């Protein structure tokens, strides 16, 4: 009952169904009752969750929450420690603060990812008329559009938009634009006649928001508001549940791994702490420290900086993203569903073929005229060109000489518009040529005549003849011809010619193209003197026994770059499906033209006509291609749609409703596809909202289409999709490189605390310094891995299995966390005991030393040599410990970022230095280091110490070891691609 049946009702029933009059409309009272029952004739705007509740969710998350807890412990500790008058550590204040900055600064990164921040129903009620004329109690007047109610009697005209979903009762030459439903701006006729089962195809339903191109009609309002077909398209778009992009899923998964590990580590040692005799309040502070050490505070930040720089790169190819997540998705996409008109095609009727001289020729239908033309040496051709040029009434608006001919705006229907553009492309200036042959007489195209004719003075001064030129439907042009132009000579139209013609006509018909015949007849001066008075109402001229010249056929042709883009995608393992509202025959022709259907693919219908067998005996597997109309789709079951998708790898869905587009996208999704969707129209918005990424054309796109998109091709260059595929596959490959590099240093920030707790050595690595490494020193190096190039031939690889190929996996985590990270902690501790001993504290003295070390009532503690030490002097030496541990990690992050440059390939072939941005990041890394060390004051602001050259050298053999270890590892997998070594130790 959501569904319109009112097209199949009599007036008696429609009047009974609505308690209305088909000629006097609703009673004024019942109108205002019904208005209270149904509400206004308007689309309800589903409020997007308010702007700041959007920002609150960013604050939450596995990593965000641990920071909260840690900042809270820092406050609680700060309060408890200061409620006993201990003013000695405001570290637990500043630690608390910095954490909160990080939580908030991180949450800001997440929220400003969404540049667009807009609601779709805004564009939808910009498609809606503000006024309507209605009749109630037999009084016609202009009402507000929103006041209409089902049952209202409504009068439409050309120029005005249709005020509701209307069941048409009477019409006078009335045509509408249904492109918001079908994507097709071709005018459709509205009558009161019931011409189809579907109300989407019948003539006596007119649709809310569609534009009435011409004529007039009256009809009954059978739906209003969100019940109208535009209101349902809108609902489908708004009501799509907000599912997570492929990379959001990946980020969440890695975060879940980290947060789980952090709670486990923090909680087991809290126990261990309490078990070896610490006070609960101190173990609570260890839990905070372990969390702060293990969690990568800078990680999510680095990830979105990498996405930012891919978004930057895409945008320079005129490919504009609306949310940083959308910058990855085309790399993970495995099925593209594409609207045909204005996406694949130019949305412009273009001359495509010509039948003359008994042969079909192919015109160059590209927008840049970059294609293959047809032979124009023929004198049959010079003649046909004369006819299609003179017999045309369309016009270029002036001053367009700077414009490319295809872009030029012309006054005329699509057909004559195409013919005129075709003629100016073929010959210099069609309007100039036409003026040389002055139009003596003319009859425009008619419904009764079913052709268009005009007679013309000729250009030669010497030649006094009058040439008659005519076009119309080919069969009906031909039934008025007696001869035909063939190879210069003119022959009587014998049976063999008439049959030749019919096959050509039906041939171009089969290519989903519109077809026109074109004939001429030269009038002598003997029967028609130079000043003969050609009178249209007299028919004083002939309209039979003309000379046939040729057929011309036209189609909305592919955009020039679109067919190569499609092969590139398929080459990269992506399935490509056509999903259009246009008619199947055109859709299939264009699918073939563009590469969606490979040369040699047959449908089961194709096979059946070759083998001359019924289709029900064709084995469905044998057909590589398939064309399913919306009616069939409506009839199918989901198991059947799936069965079709699995069976025919080259799939065309034509004559589909907006919901049917959604249902196809979703079907692919349930099957396991990451689905992209390329469209330019209002009817695409549900399919756009529901894809994992939606791409709109920037120029020929509709607002609703651009609003529901995640990505916008600003120049309409479909080939940009191919770029997106690549950049996506790169950014994913490179993110695991930064993530691997950023995670690996977490382990040597952890282990110092684990040892400190369990061994009571002086504290090796403090929090303030970790944050410096995490949020400052290593930030640029991790980002620079974004710039890394592809190790493999990325465009020939299949799209990644979303279920088994993840951004962070156990092999990547274990190797980075427990091998490279472990080497880094052994370096740290080696430099720690090195700097302690060279300063008077032998390692055995450090075990259990912590209590006395950290005692402010102990100003003369003795070291290994017997030297007595103040708490102050000990404190600064503790800072020296923090610093050596810091620079051990930094020196290893040089080795680390180098070995992360490649996951398969050795650093000796790709080299070390081709990535320019990475080496500046390494150099900035070491500069920000020397500053923190040797800038004066640094020991008292940030706890950093001017270490000696020797302790920079100490961890270098460990860094070198890391390089050599990984290099050996990577060679192992190149030389044994199936072995255990490869299985277990490749990340």
């Amino acid at each position: 009952g959501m569904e319109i049946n009112d097209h199949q009702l009599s007036v008696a029933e429609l009047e009974q169904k609505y308690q209305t009059s088909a000629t006097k409309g609703l009673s004024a009272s019942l109108a205002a009752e019904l208005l209270l029952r149904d509400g206004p004739n308007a689309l309800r705007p589903p409020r997007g969750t308010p702007e700041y509740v959007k920002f609150a969710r960013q604050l939450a998350g596995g990593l965000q929450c641990l920071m909260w807890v840690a900042a809270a412990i820092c406050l609680i500790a700060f309060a408890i420690q200061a409620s006993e008058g201990d003013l000695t550590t405001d570290d637990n204040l500043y630690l608390a603060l910095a954490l909160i900055a990080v939580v908030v600064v991180t949450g800001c990164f997440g929220y400003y990812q969404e540049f667009k921040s807009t609601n779709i129903i805004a564009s939808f009620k910009n498609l809606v008329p503000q006024q309507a004329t209605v009749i109630r109690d037999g009084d016609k007047f202009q009402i507000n559009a929103d006041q209409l109610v089902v049952g209202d009697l409504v009068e439409m005209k050309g120029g005005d938009r249709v005020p509701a979903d209307i069941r048409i009762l009477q019409a006078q030459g009335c045509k509408v634009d249904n492109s918001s439903l079908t994507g097709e701006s071709e005018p459709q006729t509205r009558s009161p006649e019931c011409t189809h089962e579907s109300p989407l195809e019948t003539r006596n339903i007119a649709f809310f928001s569609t534009m009435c191109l011409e004529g007039t009609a009256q009809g009954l309002v059978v739906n209003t508001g969100d019940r109208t077909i535009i209101g349902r398209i809108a609902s489908l778009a708004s009501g799509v549940e907000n599912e997570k992009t492929p990379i959001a899923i990946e980020i969440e998964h890695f975060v879940d791994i980290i947060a789980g590990l952090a709670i486990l580590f923090g909680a087991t040692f809290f126990i261990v702490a309490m078990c070896i005799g610490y006070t609960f309040l101190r173990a609570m502070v260890f839990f905070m420290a372990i969390v702060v050490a293990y969690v990568p505070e800078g990680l999510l930040a680095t990830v979105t900086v990498c996405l930012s720089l891919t978004a930057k790169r895409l945008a320079s190819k005129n490919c504009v993203v609306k949310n940083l997540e959308a910058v990855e998705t085309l790399g993970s996409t495995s099925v593209i569903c594409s609207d045909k008109t204005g996406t694949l095609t130019q949305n412009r009727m273009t001359v495509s073929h010509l039948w003359f001289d008994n042969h079909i020729h192919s015109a160059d239908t590209t927008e840049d005229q970059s294609g293959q033309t047809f032979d124009q040496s023929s004198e049959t051709w010079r003649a046909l060109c004369r006819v299609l040029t003179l017999c045309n009434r369309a016009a270029f608006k002036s001053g367009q000489d700077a414009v490319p001919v295809p872009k030029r705006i012309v006054i005329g229907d699509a057909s004559e518009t195409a013919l005129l553009k075709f003629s100016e492309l073929t010959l210099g200036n069609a309007m100039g040529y036409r003026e040389r042959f002055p139009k003596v007489c003319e009859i425009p195209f008619n419904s009764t005549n079913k052709f268009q004719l005009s007679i013309h003075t000729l250009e030669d001064p010497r030649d006094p003849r009058h040439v008659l030129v005519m076009k119309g439907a080919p069969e009906r042009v031909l039934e008025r011809c007696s001869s035909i132009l063939i190879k210069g000579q003119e022959l009587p139209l014998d049976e063999q010619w008439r049959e030749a013609f019919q096959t050509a006509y039906l041939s171009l018909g089969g290519l989903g193209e519109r077809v026109l015949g074109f004939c001429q007849l030269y009038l002598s001066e003997k029967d028609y003197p130079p000043g003969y008075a050609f009178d249209v109402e007299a028919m004083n001229f002939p309209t039979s026994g003309l000379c046939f010249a040729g057929l011309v056929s036209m189609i909305d042709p592919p955009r020039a770059t679109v067919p190569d883009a499609v092969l590139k995608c398929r080459t990269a393992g992506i399935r490509v499906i056509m999903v259009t509202g246009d008619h199947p025959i055109t859709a299939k022709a264009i699918a073939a033209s563009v590469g969606i259907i490979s040369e040699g693919s047959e449908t089961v219908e194709d096979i059946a006509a070759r083998l001359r067998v019924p289709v029900d005996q064709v084995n469905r597997k044998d057909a590589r291609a398939c064309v399913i109309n919306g009616m069939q789709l409506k009839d199918m079951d989901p198991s059947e749609l799936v069965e079709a998708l699995r069976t025919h790898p080259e799939m065309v869905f034509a004559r589909t409703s907006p919901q049917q587009k959604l249902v196809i996208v979703e079907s692919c999704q349930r099957l396991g596809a990451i689905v992209a969707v390329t469209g330019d129209g209002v009817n695409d918005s549900p399919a756009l909202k529901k894809a994992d990424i939606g791409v709109a054309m920037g120029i020929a796109g509709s607002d609703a289409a651009k609003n529901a998109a995640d990505m916008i091709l600003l120049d309409d260059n479909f080939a940009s999709i191919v770029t997106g595929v690549e950049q996506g596959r790169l950014i994913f490959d490179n993110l695991k490189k930064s993530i691997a590099y950023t995670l690996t240093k977490n382990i040597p920030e952890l282990t110092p605390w684990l040892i400190y707790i369990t061994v009571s050595v002086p504290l090796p690595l403090g929090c303030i310094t970790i944050l410096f490494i995490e949020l400052c020193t290593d930030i640029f190096p991790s980002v620079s891995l974004a710039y890394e190039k592809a190790e493999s031939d990325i465009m020939h690889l299949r799209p990644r299995n979303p279920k088994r190929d993840r951004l962070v996996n156990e092999p990547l985590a274990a190797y980075s966390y427990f091998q490279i990270g472990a080497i880094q902690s052994f370096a740290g501790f080696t430099d720690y005991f090195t700097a302690m001993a060279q300063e008077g504290w032998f390692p055995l003295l450090c075990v259990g030393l912590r209590p006395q070390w950290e005692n402010h009532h102990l100003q003369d503690l003795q070291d290994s040599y017997g030297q007595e030490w103040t708490f102050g002097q000990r404190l600064y030496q503790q800072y020296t410990c923090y610093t050596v541990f810091f620079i051990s990690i930094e020196m290893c992050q040089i080795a680390d970022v180098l070995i992360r440059k490649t996951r398969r390939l050795s650093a000796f072939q790709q080299g070390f230095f081709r990535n320019r941005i990475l080496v500046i990041a390494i150099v900035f890394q070491v500069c920000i280091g020397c500053f923190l060390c040797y800038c004066p004051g640094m020991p008292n602001i940030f706890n950093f110490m001017p270490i000696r050259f020797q302790w920079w050298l100490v961890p270098m053999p460990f860094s070198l070891l890391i390089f050599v270890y990984d290099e050996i590892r990577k060679l192992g997998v190149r030389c044994c691609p199936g072995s255990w070594w490869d299985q277990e130790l490749y990340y």
Partner: protein, 262 residues
């Protein structure tokens, strides 16, 4: 299975444990090399020991530093202060000093060969009686009973540190804030002038002078008023001792709150 098969689990464990043994070996070796790097007698560097710390006894800490408070009228308020003072001095008894020797040079006691027993260097005696009126004899209440208490000022030792040759390093105690209503902090120091004899320097480290004992100086405060809170700063006046550091209040000086109740 919890991620692999029962034989794939064993072969990764064997690798990780191998990795960990090798890395623990490399580490253990590094530490061992480090320890033959190290001379057992003189530290490699003395970066945090530019100037010696200073401590006092008895050390009683409140919050924010040394706070000492007692009632002259009640013997039990200063008992523990006496007790820690006596108990500290026990290592400075004539028998406790059996490993050190008589030093008369009043100049740096430079020793290059280890002529003392068990291949060590000689260390100079410092006996508690060198503190005279503050030695616990004849007054075992160490000045406190009479409201004129002794605090002992000890200079942290540092290997091969030499405090300056022109005279011996001296202690000076004064009030931190001279009271507008009162006179300067009047103190008598034992030994005379409050000096550390030069022959207690250099320290050569616990291994070379196991019986080494820090020279002391007592600061007998004579001026301090009853039932008022004061603050006393004792600075070491030596050429190579500094007491200006704002991040180490105990570098070259020591300060304490004092209140003498009645």
């Amino acid at each position: 299975m919890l991620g692999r098969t029962l034989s794939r689990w064993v072969w990764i464990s064997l690798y990780y444990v191998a990795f960990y043994v090798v890395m623990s070996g490399i580490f253990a070796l590094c530490i061992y090399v480090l320890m033959r790097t190290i001379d057992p007698y003189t530290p490699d560097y003395q970066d945090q020991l530019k100037s010696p710390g200073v401590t006092l006894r008895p050390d009683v800490y409140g919050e924010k530093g040394l706070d000492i408070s007692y009632n002259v009228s009640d013997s039990t308020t200063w008992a523990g202060l006496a007790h820690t003072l006596h108990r500290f001095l026990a290592g400075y008894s004539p028998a406790a000093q059996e490993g050190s020797i008589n030093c008369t040079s009043e100049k740096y006691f430079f020793q290059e060969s280890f002529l003392a027993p068990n291949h060590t260097k000689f260390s100079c005696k410092f006996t508690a009686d060198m503190l005279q009126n503050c030695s616990g004899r004849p007054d075992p209440t160490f000045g406190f009973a009479e409201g004129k208490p002794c605090f002992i000022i000890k200079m942290n030792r540092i290997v091969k540190f030499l405090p300056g040759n022109s005279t011996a390093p001296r202690v000076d105690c004064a009030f931190l804030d001279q009271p507008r209503d009162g006179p300067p902090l009047q103190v008598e120091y034992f030994p005379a002038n409050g000096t550390y004899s030069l022959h207690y320097f250099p320290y050569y480290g616990k291994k070379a002078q196991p019986h080494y004992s820090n020279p002391l100086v007592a600061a007998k405060l004579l001026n301090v008023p009853r039932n008022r809170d004061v603050v006393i700063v004792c600075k070491i006046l030596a050429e190579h001792v500094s007491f200006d550091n704002p991040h180490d209040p105990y570098e070259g000086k020591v300060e304490f709150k004092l209140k003498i109740q009645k």
